[PDB]
Design a protein around this nucleic acid. Structure first.
Length: 112
DNA sequence: AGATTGTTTACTGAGA
DNA sequence: TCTCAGTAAACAATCT
């Protein structure tokens, strides 16, 4: 275990932001992972475990709603992820007091 | 096969 | 001290 110099934003906030900026306000996991590394080039680099963290966030926060790529086959894969913004704990959209921090200070304008 | 997706467990270190 | 976003991985099912 170790902490990496990621952008000063929660994985929640960065996921929510890419979903909310998408055309239909929904993205597959692959699109999420692709858009996040575009907006934050640190993720384009060698470290790849953030892709695990990201996937983990999508399942751990109620604000992340999986809508099925197929109504039938509810066990399928490759589904679209949406964010229910009112269910977002508003402090997680704010820039983090971490080493790296020592775009904007609050991600709310990109999301609501 | 071997990779990905979805969920889940299990811990970690930094910041209140 | 206590919490929890961050990070690692096991696992089941699907996907290529």
């Amino acid at each position: 275990y170790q902490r990496y110099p990621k952008p000063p934003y929660s994985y929640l906030a960065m996921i929510a932001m890419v979903i909310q900026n998408s055309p239909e306000k929904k993205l597959t996991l692959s699109e999420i992972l692709k858009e996040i590394s575009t907006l934050f080039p640190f993720f384009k680099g060698n470290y790849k475990g953030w892709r695990d963290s990201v996937r983990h966030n999508l399942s751990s926060y109620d604000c992340f709603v999986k809508v099925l790529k197929d109504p039938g086959k509810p066990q399928g894969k490759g589904n679209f992820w949406t964010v229910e913004v009112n269910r977002i704990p508003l402090e997680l959209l704010k820039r983090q007091n971490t080493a790296v921090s020592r775009f904007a200070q609050d991600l709310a304008p990109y999301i609501f």
